[PDB]
Paper text:
However, analyses of the formation of TF complexes on DNA have revealed that many TFs also bind together across the family boundaries, in a DNA-dependent or DNA-facilitated manner. Because the DNA-bound TFs are fixed at particular positions relative to each other, the contact surfaces required for cooperative DNA-facilitated binding are very small, and can evolve rapidly. We also generated an unseen test set by solving six structures that represent several TF–TF–DNA complexes bound to optimal DNA sequences. The structures included two BARHL2 homodimers with two spacings, HOXB13 homodimer and TEAD4–HOXB13, MEIS1–HOXB13 and FOXK1–ELF1 heterodimers.
For example, paralogues of FOXK and FOXI forkhead proteins interacted with the ELF paralogue group of class I ETS factors to form a specific type of composite motif that was different from those formed by other forkhead proteins such as FOXA1. In some cases, such as ELF1–FOXK2, we observed even larger differences, and on visual inspection the composite motifs also appeared quite different from either one or both of the individual motifs. Despite the clear difference, the ELF1–FOXK2 motif was also highly enriched in overlapping ELF1 and FOXK2 ChIP–seq peaks, but not in the non-overlapping peaks, indicating that even such novel motifs that do not resemble the individual motifs are bound by TF–TF pairs in vivo. Recently released versions of RoseTTAFold (RoseTTAFold2NA v.0.2)39 and AlphaFold (AlphaFold v.3.0), which can predict the structures of protein–nucleic acid complexes, performed much better in predicting the overall geometry of TF–TF–DNA complexes. In predicting heterodimers, AlphaFold 3 succeeded in predicting the overall geometry of the HOXB13–TEAD4, FOXK1–ELF1, MEIS1–HOXB13 and DLX3–MEIS1 heterodimers; RoseTTAFold2NA could predict only HOXB13–TEAD4 and FOXK1–ELF1. Neither program was able to correctly predict the contacts between FOXK1–ELF1, MEIS1–HOXB13 and DLX3–MEIS1 complexes that contribute to the composite motif formation.
Author numbering:
A (entry chain H): 206 to 293
B (entry chain I): 304 to 396
C (entry chain E): 304 to 398
Write the structure that this text describes.
DNA sequence: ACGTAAACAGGAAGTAA
DNA sequence: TTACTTCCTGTTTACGT
């Protein structure tokens, strides 16, 4: 409820029960991360708007959207890897 | 500088090198490339050959991927039945 | 139940059936479904396969959409270079 | 002679805030 | 307005027979 996708991702990264398993940091220093179990992550994200069977296709669209805003970017060549541009 | 080994032999070698006696297609590829520079990932024919070999040889057995690590491809191991012999001969130029 | 033809072959067939030797992805889909009931639009895997095939095969050429019916997608036709042969073999069942 | 599954892109129209 | 979402068409990668 009242959560952004990037924020959710960050939360997941932070929490131990999802810290390596579903998502991991490639290069935490540069804010680069890799969706290990893409599907599961997508599902979880969906859960927040009920939408149970959320597929990484729909969710991928969302992430892509973030490109124009300048919030996330694609790691062009690494499978399942994006880079937060806004971070502490 | 084409290595005098059979694709099967190479595969076997790769498997043996693995810490858990298993490898993904990708892993196998990697192993091959690092060992022998002649097999540049650039050209895909050898990769295809490797895949063909895997599909064919009954002593190569396929492991399904899990929800512990749902990723790209499945895991490959050698049939214990005739593994040892293969391993032995794996480097017999 | 599964038609013994290659996705490419099916595509070719569809194209041939078209009045102007063209079809939209949607059109292709439709053609396939009407011909062979095994390919129910319900399941999407085959559709994906078809799209993949289209993307790959150099003898499938892409045409830009018009103001006759501006909707979903562009038009697909067969490269004259090797069209005839494809058409001929388009209905050659598999061993 | 591919078959099949999935990642990755982006326009366009819906839905919710 | 912003923030995804559904849906569609397309390209591309990767694995396996």
């Amino acid at each position: 409820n009242t959560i952004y996708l990037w924020e959710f991702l960050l939360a997941l990264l932070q929490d131990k029960a999802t810290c390596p398993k579903y998502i991991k940091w490639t290069q935490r220093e540069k804010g680069i991360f890799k969706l290990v179990d893409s599907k599961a992550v997508s599902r979880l994200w969906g859960k927040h708007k009920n939408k149970p069977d959320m597929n990484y296709e729909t969710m991928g669209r969302a992430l892509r959207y973030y490109y124009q805003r300048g919030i996330l970017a694609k790691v062009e060549g690494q499978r399942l890897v994006y880079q937060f541009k806004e971070m502490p | 500088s084409k290595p005098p080994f059979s694709y099967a032999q190479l595969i076997v070698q790769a498997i043996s090198s693995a810490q858990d006696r298993q490898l993904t297609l990708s892993g196998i590829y990697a192993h091959i490339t690092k060992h022998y520079p002649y097999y540049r990932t650039a050209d895909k024919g050898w990769q295809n050959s490797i895949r063909h070999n895997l599909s064919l040889n009954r002593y190569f057995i396929k492991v399904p991927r899990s929800q512990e690590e749902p990723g790209k491809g499945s895991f490959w191991r050698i049939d214990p039945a005739s593994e040892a012999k293969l391993v032995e001969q794996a480097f017999r130029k």
